[PDB]
Each structure stands twice: as structure tokens, then as C-alpha cells.
Amino acid sequence: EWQGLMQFTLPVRLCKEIELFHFDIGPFENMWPGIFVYMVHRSCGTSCFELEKLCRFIMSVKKNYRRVPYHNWKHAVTVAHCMYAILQNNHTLFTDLERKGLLIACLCHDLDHRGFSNSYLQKFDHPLAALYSTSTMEQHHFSQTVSILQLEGHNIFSTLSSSEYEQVLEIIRKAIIATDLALYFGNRKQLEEMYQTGSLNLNNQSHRDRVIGLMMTACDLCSVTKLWPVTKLTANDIYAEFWAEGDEMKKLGIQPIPMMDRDKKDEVPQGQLGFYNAVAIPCYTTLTQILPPTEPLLKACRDNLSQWEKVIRGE
Ligand SMILES: Cc1cc(C)n2cc(CSc3nc(-c4ccccc4)cn3C)nc2n1
Numbered sequence: 001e002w003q004g005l006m007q008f009t010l011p012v013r014l015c016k017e018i019e020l021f022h023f024d025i026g027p028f029e030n031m032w033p034g035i036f037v038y039m040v041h042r043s044c045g046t047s048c049f050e051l052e053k054l055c056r057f058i059m060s061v062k063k064n065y066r067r068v069p070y071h072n073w074k075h076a077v078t079v080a081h082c083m084y085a086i087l088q089n090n091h092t093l094f095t096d097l098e099r100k101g102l103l104i105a106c107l108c109h110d111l112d113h114r115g116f117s118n119s120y121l122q123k124f125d126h127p128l129a130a131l132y133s134t135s136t137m138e139q140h141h142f143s144q145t146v147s148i149l150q151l152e153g154h155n156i157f158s159t160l161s162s163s164e165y166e167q168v169l170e171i172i173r174k175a176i177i178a179t180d181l182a183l184y185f186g187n188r189k190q191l192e193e194m195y196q197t198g199s200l201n202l203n204n205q206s207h208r209d210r211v212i213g214l215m216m217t218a219c220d221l222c223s224v225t226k227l228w229p230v231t232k233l234t235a236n237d238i239y240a241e242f243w244a245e246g247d248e249m250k251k252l253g254i255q256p257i258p259m260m261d262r263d264k265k266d267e268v269p270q271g272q273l274g275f276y277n278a279v280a281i282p283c284y285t286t287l288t289q290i291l292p293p294t295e296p297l298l299k300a301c302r303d304n305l306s307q308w309e310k311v312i313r314g315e
């Protein structure tokens with residue numbers, strides 16, 4: 001698997017389309033590892049990761065994603081592509097070490113997801129909720145990233161200074177932690193405040209960490225920014241995962257929240273509408289304010305909102 005990927009070349013028709021925000025990796029499964037290498041080399045250069053280490057690392061990340069309906073290998077590459085398009089469009093705002101770190105973090109941000117939420121693990125006193133009190137799965141995801149980095153011939157960062165090693169591990173840690181959707185609502189509200197008061201400053205490291213947090217959310221949610229048919233089809237995978245969890249809660253006499261109750265699947269269109277209004281629209285709005293070249297994400301999300309409004313009135 002590793003050897004074959006060192007000798008992979010991305011077709012020239014994808015070389016133009018991979019740069020666009022709306023790009024759907026969905027149809028090119030066999031090319032996803034090589035698409036990630038392509039995005040790294042274009043963003044960071046051919047020179048900086050040892051190719052043998054990168055391909056060994058990439059194939060071990062793929063193996064450590066589970067066959068779950070949504071939080072899977074496909075989803076990892078979808079989020080890395082969105083970060084790539086954000087970085088390309090805002091390249092000089094971020095440092096070489098931030099581009100390295102943010103693409104690896106997106107690829108690794110859901111490592112070993114079990115198809116269960118933090119609530120589930122916490123309410124049902126799962127061990128991981130004992131290890132990790134808050135941001136339960138996200139801390140595990142970072143723990144899994146460090147473990148793969150420390151396998152034989154996987155340390156893609158082994159050419160950095162010890163100072164830069166701890167810097168990229170902290171960029172990765174914060175970025176993976178910030179995909180806790182529970183943290184996003186606070187983060188986005190502050191950044192929206194900092195934007196309106198004119199206090200937002202990218203050279204301020206805590207401000208810089210919050211803008212990166214919002215980018216991670218923007219990337220995590222980006223299926224709502226694809227063409228309508230792709231968005232509709234990804235939602236299937238999301239509810240399949242939520243509904244499987246609702247079923248486990250019912251077996252234990254717990255009624256799930258509607259979003260996880262497969263008996264309430266009628267109400268999906270209004271569920272998506274609410275998520276767009278409360279979560280997705282504000283996310284890409286604030287992101288477009290801070291990083292205006294990210295506006296096509298807001299446009300595509302708006303197009304998918306009116307599509308759901310259409311569906312709600314039998315169209
Ligand atoms: C890309 C993406 C990422 C995340 C985390 N998503 C979460 C959801 C679900 S939105 C939703 N559906 C319902 C609901 C309630 C009753 C019946 C049916 C559905 C309620 N909410 C809030 N979609 C998502 N997409």
C-alpha cells in the first residue's frame with residue numbers, strides 16, 4: 001500500500017478541480033491517500049516531509065479509521081481537502097509549521113471514532129470519559145495521532161528542531177480539540193465580537209488559535225458546502241451513525257434526543273434547517289468576515305439552506 005502511493009500521480013483533470021472549495025473527493029476513493037500527498041506537497045512543498053515516512057504515516061492513519069457510517073477515512077480526507085483550499089486561498093497568513101500541522105490534524109482529527117458522541121461516553125461512564133473528562137473523543141483522537149507518529153518510520157516531524165516539534169504538536173492538539181462542537185459556540189461568539197470591535201489581530205497568539213479553531217469547524221462541517229446531492233447523501237451517513245447510537249440508548253431504557261431517534265426521521269429536513277441556521281451559517285459567516293477568500297463556503301451553505309427550505313414545503 002505504502003510503496004504504491006510513493007509512485008502515485010494525480011490525474012491532470014483533478015489538478016484544476018482540487019483547488020475549488022466545492023470539490024467532492026467522493027468518486028475517487030482509490031486516489032484519497034495520493035490526493036492528501038498532493039495537497040501536502042502543493043501547500044508545504046515536495047521537500048519537507050520524507051516521502052517514505054509520509055506515505056507510511058498516511059496508510060497507518062487510514063487503517064486507524066473505523067468502518068463507521070460518517071466519522072471514517074472518507075470524512076478525514078474531506079476535512080483535509082477543505083483546509084487545503086482555505087490555506088491555498090490565504091497561504092501567506094499562516095506559517096510553514098501551521099500548514100504542516102493543520103493538514104495532518106484535519107487528516108487525524110477523528111482517528112478511531114467509534115460512532116459514539118462525547119455525551120454517550122460521559123452519561124454511560126465509558127473508560128475514555130474517565131481518561132478524558134471534557135472533549136472526550138477529541139483528546140483520544142490527539143492521543144491516537146501521537147501514537148502513530150511514534151511508530152517505526154512514521155515520525156514525519158523527525159527533521160524538526162525539538163522546539164518546532166513541540167510547536168507543531170501544540171498546533172495539532174489545539175486544532176483537534178477545537179473540533180469539539182461544544183467548544184465552537186463560545187469560540188465563534190468571541191471571534192465575532194473581536195471582528196466587530198476591530199480588536200481581532202492575527203499576530204496575537206490566542207486570537208490566532210481561535211481563528212484556527214473556527215477553520216477546523218469550517219472544515220469539519222464542509223459537507224454542507226458541497227453540491228446539494230452530495231450534501232443530501234452525506235446527511236444519510238450522519239443520521240445512520242446518530243440513529244445507531246439512539247438504538248443503544250433505547251436498549252438501556254434511555255429515550256435519545258430526537259436527532260438520534262430513527263422513529264423521528266420524518267423531522268430530518270427541519271433538523272438540517274435548524275443546524276444550518278444555528279451552527280453552519282454563523283460558522284462560514286464569521287469565517288468569511290475574518291478570511292474573505294473563504295466566501296464560496298458561505299455561498300454553497302446558503303444554496304443548501306434554501307434547498308432544505310424547498311424540501312420542507314414538498315419540493
Ligand atoms: C455536516 C454535519 C455535521 C454535524 C455535526 N451535523 C449534525 C447534524 C444533525 S442536524 C439535526 N437534525 C436534527 C433532527 C431532529 C429530529 C429529527 C431528525 C433530525 C436536529 N439537529 C440539530 N447534521 C450535521 N451535519
Ligand SMILES: [Mg+2]
Pocket residue numbers: 071109110179
Ligand atoms: Mg469529531
Ligand SMILES: [Zn+2]
Pocket residue numbers: 071075079109110179220
Ligand atoms: Zn470530523
